[PDB]
């Protein structure tokens with residue numbers, strides 16, 4: 001019962017599951033409604049037959065989500081633990097996940113709006129890191145966008161596909177996941193946002209990505225990208241873990257750039273892949 005100390009217990013009569021929107025570890029995820037007039041929610045279930053480890057992980061997940069209370073972290077509405085199936089219930093965003101959102105809205109936002117999304121993501125990550133929580137799977141697909149353009153860090157589980165091109169070298173090579181490997185991932189998220197959801201490294205295979213990184217290559221600047229933003233993402237990709245900025249440094253820089261917005265007018269040179277010659 002101590003694991004669920006920051007959570008509210010929801011009675012099953014208050015929950016209506018409507019459509020399957022995904023799969024959990026041992027159950028389905030649904031889009032539904034919560035009566036507490038009604039509010040749309042996402043609902044992850046733990047279905048009959050779950051193992052002891054699955055129960056420990058499921059209630060542990062609920063417990064930490066209840067612990068987190070931050071503008072840029074997905075909100076837990078509550079948990080059903082006293083009845084079967086057990087459920088984790090979160091807020092729901094009609095705009096959905098950030099990766100698909102940006103790809104469907106290519107070129108529709110200002111630079112200031114894009115950088116503001118990154119400041120929010122960075123604030124959520126600073127909070128998680130300070131709370132001693134290592135995310136391990138930070139990517140645009142794990143970020144929800146609300147109707148105010150506020151980004152909420154989430155974790156929907158692996159898509160399970162290993163996200164090599166979001167993962168820092170030390171986490172791939174020897175399983176060292178820390179808030180500094182999350183900083184590497186945040187740099188990739190910065191590139192995802194500024195490109196409107198382009199695939200990191202394009203058609204390179206996972207092996208080719210790792211080889212390029214080991215050889216010293218890094219993603220080139222997005223089109224129309226502020227110089228300061230590319231400089232920042234490049235510093236997230238330092239091979240030496242200890243040289244990367246901490247999330248506190250990232251938040252501070254992004255906040256200062258937004259508050260002095262002329263700083264974002266200086267653009268990094270874009271390397272064109274194709275030359276068009278006209279008079």
Ligand SMILES: Cc1ccc(C(=O)Nc2cccc(C(F)(F)F)c2)cc1Nc1nc(N2CC[C@H](O)C2)nc(-n2ccnc2)n1
Pocket residue numbers: 021022023029042043044061065068073074088089090091092093094096097128135144153154155156
């Ligand atoms: C129900 C649910 C359960 C858990 C989580 C979750 O984040 N746990 C987590 C665990 C550890 C750390 C963090 C931390 F906070 F740190 F990052 C977060 C999110 C959702 N909620 C949810 N799940 C989906 N899924 C899952 C299957 C598909 O991918 C779609 N979709 C939406 N959704 C869609 C549109 N509006 C909302 N909501």
